[PDB]
């Protein structure tokens, strides 16, 4: 059982960085995050059209799974605010359906291994191996081809800012000029709490983006570190925790977006 | 007495000086070619004499109806006996002399340290009196609980008592407990063994530290303001001495109770 | 560093908006229509 | 490929770990999920 | 003689002890005596 | 601090104290209490 924890074949170190730019020969540079964003856009669109291409009674197969997921999300959002459950559903459904597969793509084999480059070999008396990389030649860093889309502070910041813009717009949509009434209303002590609530609303998109990016980045780095410590049979529970927490983060991103929208409208 | 006390600045006139009393060991009182009579042994003998005197005073007659000192001694003994019976049922007689003698002795030792002149009266080997001469001043009547030797002795005697009675109650099995279980009482057994081993050290250190801290606290409060400032601390110490005595007695008996069962 | 490139940020925002609209016109609307059909034709 | 670069050994560890995780999930988290889907589709069949 | 006496410390200790004894006799005198008398009466009545 | 002669003397004194109180302070009072309780 534990006798097969051979570290004679393991990674040399733990490469950690933010989003790394791909070659990007033409203008409009694309990164490793903006190739996995495209690949997961393609996957989600293909999945949606496959579930949609034949819609009928008695769902079974891809259509049944899609209906179950969609109705579960609809019931979850309805429990918070039934008035806007359908007016804002596409945003807080695509957020989940995208972030979930973004987090689950980072765990696929080869994420952090295939790069584009823009026993005897391992060191002894150490618990971590030191086998070099294929593009050690030319002294390159082996820029990973695939990264988790949420592990980049650009895509996550983008979804946070679109969520914040949506919340602000549809709080302004039906409240009159009541936003100025919730903050700095000079109703005795209500002015201070209104200013604090305005500050909190301002920092909400930053909190969401930082939370999602940090969770996904930390999961991927923990996986790399556990692989470095012991290549096999060590990162199994950590892989399970990572997939669970990726699904969790995907769900609560949409949940927090809709909850903030509800607290804004009412 | 009003709260507008003007004698709060008595340190201007009565300056006790730095708390010279900081000795955390035994200081020899009398130079003898044999064993040295430390400052704690003399007070221990004094407390033994006082205990025997009160015992013979309340026990010279043994009147049926308790009155006077006999009533007080009967009350304290009966309270202790009822407490021990509450802790354990059948072994009250086995441990009663030890756990009541220890209570009375350490109680009188703790309450003796608060007596005036404990930190002042002493023997030549702000500036006290002796430091004026070439011989240093070493204080007299250092409470027996303040000494680490006496506390260690009573703690080890309690440890031997507990181990012997647990062994006699539970046969040879108590020596090895249930280490053969290997399912539950395997890692817990060694834990309980080391806990029992460190039990006497904690038992002695509690008394020693409490009494030492009380004495140095009284000296320090005298250093700060030696008038009406250390009155609440005197009350706290006269309370904590009796509390520590009762805790030590109840604790050794409760450790016996957990040892037998 | 953090690498918050405004061009990349705008690209991600545009891609996410396009994904939102494509899914709304392709997945959410038909599935919600079928759910309403199967919950109101009961 | 002149540009492709693959970690020779970390990729093998990732492959083994992911395959083990997939097998474990299929062993454990495949019966409840299929049971729930079957229950939902059977309920819809009954409703029609 | 070899008697070592700290004047200020001894005076302060004596004054504090006297004040503590006085406050105790003010407070912890009636309850202890009452408990003693109650125990004495309870034992006496059992004759 | 850890003078073996000193703590040995203290231990002997404490043992003598408990063995002199039992026959003078504990046996008589316990006998009196036993008589009082057996009287009821």
């Amino acid at each position: 059982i534990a006798s097969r924890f051979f570290l004679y074949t393991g990674p040399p170190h733990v490469e950690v960085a933010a989003e790394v730019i791909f070659d990007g020969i033409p203008g409009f540079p694309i990164t490793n995050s903006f190739v996995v964003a495209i690949i997961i856009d393609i996957f989600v669109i293909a999945l949606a059209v496959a579930a949609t291409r034949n819609l009928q009674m008695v769902p079974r197969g891809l259509q049944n799974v899609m209906e179950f997921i969609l109705e579960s999300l609809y019931n979850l959002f309805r429990n918070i605010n039934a008035k806007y459950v359908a007016t804002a559903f596409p945003l807080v459904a695509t957020i989940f359906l995208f972030v979930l597969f973004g987090n689950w793509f980072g765990l696929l084999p080869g994420v952090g291994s295939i790069g584009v480059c823009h026993p005897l070999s391992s060191v002894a008396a150490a618990e971590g191996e030191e086998i070099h990389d294929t593009c050690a030649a030319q002294g390159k860093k082996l820029v990973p081809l695939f990264r988790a889309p949420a592990a980049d502070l650009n895509f996550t910041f983008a979804i946070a800012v679109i969520s914040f813009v949506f919340i602000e717009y549809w709080g302004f949509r039906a409240l009159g000029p009541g936003y100025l009434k919730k903050f700095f209303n000079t109703n005795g002590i209500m002015s201070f709490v209104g200013i604090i609530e305005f500050i909190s609303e301002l920092v909400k998109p930053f909190a969401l983006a930082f939370r999602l990016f940090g969770n996904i980045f930390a999961g991927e780095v923990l996986l790399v570190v556990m692989a470095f410590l012991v290549p096999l049979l060590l990162p199994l529970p950590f892989y399970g925790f990572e997939v669970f927490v990726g699904f969790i983060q995907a769900l609560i991103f949409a949940l927090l977006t809709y909850a903030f929208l509800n607290i804004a409208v009412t | 007495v009003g709260a507008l006390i003007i004698s709060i600045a008595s340190r201007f006139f009565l300056y006790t000086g730095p708390p010279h009393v900081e000795v955390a060991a035994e200081v020899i009182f009398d130079g003898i070619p044999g064993f040295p009579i430390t400052n704690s042994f003399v007070v221990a003998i004094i407390i033994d004499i006082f205990v025997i005197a009160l015992a013979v005073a309340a026990t010279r007659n043994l009147q049926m109806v308790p009155r006077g000192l006999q009533n007080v001694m009967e009350f304290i003994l009966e309270s202790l006996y009822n407490l021990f019976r509450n802790i354990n049922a059948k072994y009250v007689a086995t441990a009663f002399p030890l756990v009541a003698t220890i209570f009375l002795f350490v109680l009188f030792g703790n309450w003796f340290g608060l007596l005036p002149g404990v930190g002042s009266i002493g023997v030549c080997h702000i500036h006290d009196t002796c430091a004026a001469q070439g011989k240093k001043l070493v204080p007299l009547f250092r409470a027996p609980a303040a000494d680490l030797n006496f506390t260690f002795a009573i703690a080890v005697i309690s440890f031997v008592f507990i181990e012997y009675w647990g062994f006699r109650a539970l046969g040879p099995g108590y020596l090895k407990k249930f280490f053969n279980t290997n399912g539950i009482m395997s890692f817990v057994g060694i834990i309980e063994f080391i806990s029992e081993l460190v039990k006497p050290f904690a038992l002695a250190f509690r008394l020693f530290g409490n009494i030492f801290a009380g004495e140095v606290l009284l000296v320090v409060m005298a250093f700060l303001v030696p008038l009406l400032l250390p009155l609440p601390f005197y009350g706290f110490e006269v309370f904590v001495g009796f509390i520590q005595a009762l805790i030590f007695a109840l604790l050794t008996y409760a450790f016996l109770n957990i040892a037998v069962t | 560093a953090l690498g918050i490139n405004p061009t990349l940020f705008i690209a991600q925002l545009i891609n996410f908006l396009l994904l939102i609209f494509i899914l709304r016109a392709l997945l959410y609307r038909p599935v919600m229509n079928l759910l309403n059909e199967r919950t109101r034709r009961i | 490929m002149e540009a492709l670069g693959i970690n020779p050994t970390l990729f093998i560890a990732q492959l083994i770990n992911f395959l083990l995780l997939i097998f474990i999930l299929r062993a454990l988290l495949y019966r409840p999920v299929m049971n729930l889907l079957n229950e939902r589709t059977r309920r819809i069949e009954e409703s029609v | 003689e070899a008697l070592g006496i700290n004047p200020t410390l001894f005076i302060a200790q004596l004054i504090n002890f006297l004040l503590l004894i006085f406050i105790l006799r003010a407070l912890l005198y009636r309850p202890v005596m009452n408990l003693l008398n109650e125990r004495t009466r309870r034992i006496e009545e059992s004759v | 601090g850890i003078n073996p002669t000193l703590f040995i003397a203290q231990l002997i004194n404490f043992l003598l104290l408990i063995f002199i109180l039992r026959a003078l302070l504990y046996r008589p009072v316990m006998n009196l209490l036993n008589e009082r309780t057996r009287r009821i």
Partner: protein
């Protein structure tokens, strides 16, 4: 001595996480218990619950902001 800015960043983030973390935990536990006891009021509770978080978490964010002022 080397750069103390790293130690400052660490202290700021760590203590900001220390405080509002327990605050949010207590808020959520209390709100969930209140909802479970009396479901009919849940929505109202949820509102105040989020408000509480919107305060407490804010404090932590402040620390994070300070870090990004020092770390950068």
């Amino acid at each position: 001595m080397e750069g103390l800015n790293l130690v400052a960043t660490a202290l700021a983030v760590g203590l900001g996480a220390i405080g509002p973390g327990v605050g949010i935990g207590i808020i959520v536990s209390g709100a969930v218990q209140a909802i479970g006891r009396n479901p009919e009021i849940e929505n109202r509770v949820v509102t105040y619950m989020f408000i509480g978080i919107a305060f407490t978490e804010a404090l932590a964010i402040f620390g994070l902001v300070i870090a990004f002022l020092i770390g950068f």
